[PDB]
Amino acid sequence: NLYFQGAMSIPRSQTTYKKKEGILTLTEDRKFLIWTPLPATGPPTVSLALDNITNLQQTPPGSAKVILKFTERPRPNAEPGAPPPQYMFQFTHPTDARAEANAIRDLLSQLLAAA
Ligand SMILES: [Cl-]
Ligand SMILES: [Cl-]
Ligand SMILES: [Cl-]
Ligand SMILES: [Cs+]
Ligand SMILES: [K+]
């Protein structure tokens, strides 16, 4: 009856959000996905609770851009026809963009399944 939690380290990935360079990571409690614009010393501009994330999608390998797209639960007063909130992070590490995207994706999918 053993219980295991994930033990990989939390990555800090070079990513662009709405055409600004920054760092995508998770909070230490692994409850929030946070993006902070460079220099990365101010507060996050995107903070998405993992409990509110309903989907994770990626550009397929070989695409022009390496992007992860996260979808959130609809906001409380959203109109029923409206698309759900979404957040696209382009991975910009010149050699490691796809590997960094895969690392975050894998860590996120584990946490999302564990909750
Ligand atoms: Cl933290
Ligand atoms: Cl940094
Ligand atoms: Cl790729
Ligand atoms: Cs990294
Ligand atoms: K590009």
Author numbering: -6 to 108
Question: What is written in the article reporting this PDB entry?
Answer:
We investigated the introduction of cesium in form of cesium chloride during the three major steps of protein treatment in crystallography: purification, crystallization, and cryo-protection. We derived a step-wise procedure encompassing a “quick-soak”-only approach and a combined approach of CsCl supplement during purification and cryo-protection. This procedure was successfully applied on two different proteins: (i) Lysozyme and (ii) as a proof of principle, a construct consisting of the PH domain of the TFIIH subunit p62 from Chaetomium thermophilum for de novo structure determination. Second, a construct of the pleckstrin homology (PH) domain of the TFIIH subunit p62 from Chaetomium thermophilum (p62 PH), encompassing the first 109 residues. Usage of CsCl thus provides a versatile, general, easy to use, and low cost phasing strategy.
